[PDB]
Design a binder for these strands. Structure first.
Ligand SMILES: [K+]
Ligand SMILES: [K+]
Ligand SMILES: [K+]
Ligand SMILES: [K+]
Ligand SMILES: [K+]
Ligand SMILES: [K+]
Ligand SMILES: [K+]
Ligand SMILES: [K+]
Ligand SMILES: [K+]
Ligand SMILES: [K+]
Ligand SMILES: [K+]
Ligand SMILES: [K+]
Ligand SMILES: [K+]
Ligand SMILES: [K+]
Ligand SMILES: [K+]
Ligand SMILES: [Mg+2]
Ligand SMILES: [Mg+2]
Ligand SMILES: [Mg+2]
Ligand SMILES: [Mg+2]
Ligand SMILES: [Mg+2]
Ligand SMILES: [Mg+2]
Ligand SMILES: [Mg+2]
Ligand SMILES: [Mg+2]
Ligand SMILES: [Mg+2]
Ligand SMILES: [Mg+2]
Ligand SMILES: [Mg+2]
Ligand SMILES: [Mg+2]
Ligand SMILES: [Mg+2]
Ligand SMILES: [Mg+2]
Ligand SMILES: [Mg+2]
Ligand SMILES: [Mg+2]
Ligand SMILES: [Mg+2]
Ligand SMILES: [Mg+2]
Ligand SMILES: [Mg+2]
Ligand SMILES: [Mg+2]
Ligand SMILES: [Mg+2]
Ligand SMILES: [Mg+2]
Ligand SMILES: [Mg+2]
Ligand SMILES: [Mg+2]
Ligand SMILES: [Mg+2]
Ligand SMILES: [Mg+2]
Ligand SMILES: [Mg+2]
Ligand SMILES: [Mg+2]
Ligand SMILES: [Mg+2]
Ligand SMILES: [Mg+2]
Ligand SMILES: [Mg+2]
Ligand SMILES: [Mg+2]
Ligand SMILES: [Mg+2]
Ligand SMILES: [Mg+2]
Ligand SMILES: [Mg+2]
Ligand SMILES: [Mg+2]
Ligand SMILES: [Mg+2]
Ligand SMILES: [Mg+2]
Ligand SMILES: [Mg+2]
Ligand SMILES: [Mg+2]
Ligand SMILES: [Mg+2]
Ligand SMILES: [Mg+2]
Lengths: 386, 131, 62
RNA sequence: GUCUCCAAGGUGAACAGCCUCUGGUCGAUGGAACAAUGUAGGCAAGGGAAGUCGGCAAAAUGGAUCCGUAACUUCGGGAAA
RNA sequence: GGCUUGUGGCAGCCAAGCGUUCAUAGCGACGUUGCUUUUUGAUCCUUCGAUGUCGGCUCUUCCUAUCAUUGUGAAGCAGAAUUCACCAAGUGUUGGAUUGUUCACCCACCAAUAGGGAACGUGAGCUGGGUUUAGACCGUCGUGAGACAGGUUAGUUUUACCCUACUGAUGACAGUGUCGCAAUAGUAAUUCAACCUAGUACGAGAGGAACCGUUGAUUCACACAAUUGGCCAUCGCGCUUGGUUGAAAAGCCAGUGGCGCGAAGCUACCGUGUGCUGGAUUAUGACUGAACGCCUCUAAGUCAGAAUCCGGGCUAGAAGCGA
RNA sequence: CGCGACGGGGUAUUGUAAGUGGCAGAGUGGCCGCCACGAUCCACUGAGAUUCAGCCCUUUGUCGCUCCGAUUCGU
């Protein structure tokens, strides 16, 4: 018979299975649609989640209660040091989808990227790309490399660059094995894309060349892991009465008599967290460029001389010294987790998307407690230099 | 103009709040909250500025055993202002009004939340301090 | 220049984007920097009696 | 499950509970982890029985001193109201 | 459960009449044709070397005979509201008093508080209020023992470690590693309010909309912890009762002695952030246009067109595949 | 070649350590102001304690270890 009362089902069937992701680095499932009329430009970037803080800004939203008022909103700091282009790959459009045609690598590869090709770098002989790097040293070999590039210009329909992070520059991560990913190149003709990619071989691409301030981006990564978990926490089913024999953190009925099988739509206990997620429409509030005032936490209203990093350092992460992005809201994953930034696939036209951000205050008090000092000097002056 | 942002709900059904007006009622017993569409097993709840249907459990006999609308003016549950500050009052209070939001009484005792004053100009007129 | 409030209990400076504001029945407004000051206030502890508060240090000429 | 004898110090009204001396004893297979579910013990913003057949369970009350104590009553009580 | 469908429920045909006029806007008397198995009966085919027998709670899925929401046709449709009908099951359908109830009834909210199936879904899921053992009371009945689809009160709810299903976890997938492609499967967003339009269209007046746009909110989903809130055996610091080490100092015992604060970690609509776009079409309204010298959305050929469908996006990634 | 173990600094929690001194202290007991007892109070002292165990930086400084092995895999 019909259920006595109606409520929506617990959880979403669009995120199944709730298994551990088969990857640690966020995979870009779809790149932005390519517009040939625009200049060649990268579409994605890698970063590392440093921590969270809150900012205060004066809202400019005509017709809103907050118009010309101040609002406090949380933000996430993503440290985004420049990436290094080390190769190019071309794909051909076939009736069976895109097929990888060829992969051309740069002559010189850093030790950090070479570590990505080994499970035990120190114990190995470190032979990776040694024979490949030699054909850059001969005229006949150079001709072959150029011939491969011309082959991509003729047949390739999609061009992606091989780029890796400079993970050594963030000592807090305690990792020397860099992260490598394919970043699609949009804009221009195929020949321009290949020339654009080959020109960056062994060069650095700053985050500013991909993203900018006040634009909406998508963040891709793996959520925080939580291990084996019961239905109440995993799926949000309500608890059973106190007097339930054999426990109350369960689903009471897991199925009718017929079909004589448990269905895949019933909540079950299992892995929770460490799932791949793609979150949309994250506005960029600030882009910090090293060596510029934008890298500091100064604002047009607050002239206190201080850095982005809170006193005592970002908990579990360290001190941010490279380029970084200040992103509204929260980011997937734990501290130190590598996150993938992608350009929006939609046309951003809403007022919120076009709103011009103007920060008034950036909090830099300690996040390891009830921090009340924005700078170490302020704390020292408070206690008479302590 | 703009509409009021969401606030933490601290007053579910069966909550008994003080009567902050001079109508003669001493407390208001919440039986429902206007605008609640609801969820299975979820008790309707109200915040400062919400209109609720209430009964007077203690007060003048002329006001008892009757269902009348009321507006919450204070609550003890902290709620977040847009500027990041969490506010709360020392008690829970409300005032009896008519379906159009006009006060049945003529005076208000104690302060009232700014959120309630913006939505109900009649209540704000009789208020002493708007915080 | 930023507008910063002061904690009514401890006297600590409160930076924008945080703070706890309590409205007493007599319309008095109390700003607390954290739950520590909030709890001690509602526990009826006097700041003059707590060594670390600004009120104690001012009365003792610290 | 099975009769009975001897019975220290402190706290306290007290062979109550809690700690100690004489005497006895560390006998309950061990090791490493700290998931779900469980059993046992807890706590919790705001609301306060809306839960449920039903306040089930839990919480609240609790010692002592002083003050004060209604209906009703078989005049004794009720009463630690 | 099965056959049957009298009964129950739902639907059609004829047109006497109702509807101020007017059979058919909306109704359909007298008759007559059906559908349904969410009623109750009829039967006794399966089960008496046993298929756990009420209801609620919990949870998923399915149906449409559509309560609300999207798009339309009709009206005795001026507006507003309402009624009839079409495509339509994508989304939603609530908080309570009394009763063991199913059913019912009332209060209140809501866009709406539609109806049903899944062994009258669901007891090795719970609960045990009822019914339906043994104790006991009343009324009626009986000479009596005792009886009562009469009332009342107390009355043990057992087992999973097997196979499968389902949920996750390794492995396998022909050296090893990195970066990728991708069949296929899953899938998600939802509804409301305010302001403006506007006291405007419409109307004698009373009354009284809508699209665009703007700002919020509900239900839901996925994350997240800067801030607020919660949790303490940080046994972190302080305070404190009883005992104890000859005192002091410093500790220990009372399975966490107790109390205040408590970082970290975890965590809440009790906190914060985010939640998407093309194509093809249904109903329906049209274009051109014959059959049928006219006419005609239809016959050939076309157009617009939705909470629809498919894709895209999001989740997974095959004894599939590439560099 | 960095890592590891100490230590230091940063950060945070509690709330001002022990010792010394006091012409602070309700008072009380002796002696001829001195002496003894006294919870508590004040100064040194936002002090002391704790702070990754899944916090941040790090030789000013100290110390250690940098690899004995084992199991397989071929177009
Ligand atoms: K049911
Ligand atoms: K959640
Ligand atoms: K529950
Ligand atoms: K409702
Ligand atoms: K456990
Ligand atoms: K109750
Ligand atoms: K029938
Ligand atoms: K049988
Ligand atoms: K079972
Ligand atoms: K009993
Ligand atoms: K290979
Ligand atoms: K799909
Ligand atoms: K916390
Ligand atoms: K001391
Ligand atoms: K001190
Ligand atoms: Mg895809
Ligand atoms: Mg974990
Ligand atoms: Mg039980
Ligand atoms: Mg913190
Ligand atoms: Mg319920
Ligand atoms: Mg005694
Ligand atoms: Mg004893
Ligand atoms: Mg509570
Ligand atoms: Mg409380
Ligand atoms: Mg109460
Ligand atoms: Mg009840
Ligand atoms: Mg109920
Ligand atoms: Mg009890
Ligand atoms: Mg009595
Ligand atoms: Mg008939
Ligand atoms: Mg049998
Ligand atoms: Mg059986
Ligand atoms: Mg069975
Ligand atoms: Mg239909
Ligand atoms: Mg009309
Ligand atoms: Mg439906
Ligand atoms: Mg009842
Ligand atoms: Mg049936
Ligand atoms: Mg059944
Ligand atoms: Mg069963
Ligand atoms: Mg059972
Ligand atoms: Mg049952
Ligand atoms: Mg019973
Ligand atoms: Mg009996
Ligand atoms: Mg007789
Ligand atoms: Mg009974
Ligand atoms: Mg599909
Ligand atoms: Mg007019
Ligand atoms: Mg001592
Ligand atoms: Mg002992
Ligand atoms: Mg105890
Ligand atoms: Mg939330
Ligand atoms: Mg024509
Ligand atoms: Mg047509
Ligand atoms: Mg068309
Ligand atoms: Mg240290
Ligand atoms: Mg570590």
């Amino acid at each position: 018979s019909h259920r006595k009362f109606e409520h929506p089902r617990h959880g979403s069937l669009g995120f199944l299975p709730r298994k551990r992701a088969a990857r640690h680095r966020g995979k870009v499932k779809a790149f932005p649609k390519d517009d040939p009329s625009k200049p060649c430009k990268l579409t994605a970037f890698l970063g590392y989640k440093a921590g969270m803080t809150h900012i205060v800004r004066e809202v400019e939203k005509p017709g809103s209660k907050l118009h010309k008022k101040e609002t406090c909103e949380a933000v996430t700091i993503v440290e985004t040091p420049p990436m290094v282009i080390v190769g190019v790959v071309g794909y051909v459009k076939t009736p069976r989808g895109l097929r990888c045609l060829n992969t051309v690598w740069a002559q010189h590869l850093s030790e950090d990227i070479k570590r990505r090709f080994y499970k035990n770098w120190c114990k190995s002989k470190k032979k990776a790309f040694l024979k490949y790097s030699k054909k850059y040293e001969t005229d006949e070999g150079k001709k072959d490399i150029q011939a491969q590039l011309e082959k991509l210009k003729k047949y390739a329909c999609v061009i992606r660059v091989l780029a890796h992070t400079q993970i050594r520059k963030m000592k807090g991560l305690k990792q020397k094995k860099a992260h490598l990913m394919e970043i699609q190149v949009n804009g221009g003709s195929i020949a321009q894309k290949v020339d654009f990619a080959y020109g960056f071989f062994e060069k650095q691409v700053p985050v500013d060349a991909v993203f900018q301030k006040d634009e909406m981006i998508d963040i891709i990564g793996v959520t925080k892991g939580k291990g084996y978990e019961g239905v109440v926490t995993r799926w949000g089913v309500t608890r059973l009465p106190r007097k339930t024999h054999r426990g109350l953190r369960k689903v009471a009925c897991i199925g009718a008599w017929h079909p004589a099988r448990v269905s895949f739509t019933v909540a079950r206990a299992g892995q929770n967290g460490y799932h791949h997620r793609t979150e949309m429409n994250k506005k960029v509030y600030k882009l910090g460029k090293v060596g510029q005032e934008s890298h500091t936490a100064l604002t047009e209203f607050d002239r206190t001389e201080k850095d982005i990093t809170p006193i005592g350092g970002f908990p579990h992460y360290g001190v941010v010294k490279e380029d970084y992005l200040l992103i509204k809201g929260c980011c997937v994953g734990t501290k130190k987790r590598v996150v993938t930034l992608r350009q929006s696939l939609l046309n951003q036209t809403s007022r919120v998307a076009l709103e011009e951000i103007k920060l008034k205050f950036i909090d830099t008090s300690s996040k390891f407690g009830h921090g009340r000092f924005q700078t170490t000097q302020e704390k020292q002056k408070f206690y008479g230099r302590l | 103009a703009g509409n009021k942002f969401r606030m933490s709900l601290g007053l579910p059904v069966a909550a008994t709040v003080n009567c902050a007006d001079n109508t003669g009622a001493k407390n208001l017993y919440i039986i429902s909250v206007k605008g609640i569409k609801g969820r299975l097993n979820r008790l309707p709840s109200a915040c400062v500025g919400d209109m609720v249907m209430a009964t007077v459990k203690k007060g003048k006999p002329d006001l008892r055993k009757k269902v009348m609308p009321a507006v919450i003016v204070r609550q003890r549950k902290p709620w977040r202002r847009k500027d990041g500050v969490f506010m709360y009052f020392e008690d829970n209070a409300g005032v009896i009004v008519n379906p159009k939001g006009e006060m049945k009484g003529s005076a208000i005792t104690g302060p009232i939340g700014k959120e309630c004053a913006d939505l109900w100009p009649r209540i704000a007129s009789a208020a002493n301090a708007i915080v | 220049v930023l507008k910063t409030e002061l904690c009514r209990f401890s006297g600590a400076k409160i930076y924008p984007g945080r703070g706890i504001r309590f409205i007493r029945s007599d319309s008095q407004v109390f700003l607390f920097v954290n739950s520590k000051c909030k709890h001690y206030f509602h526990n009826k502890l006097k700041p003059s009696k707590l060594t670390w508060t600004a009120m104690y240090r001012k009365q003792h000429k610290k």
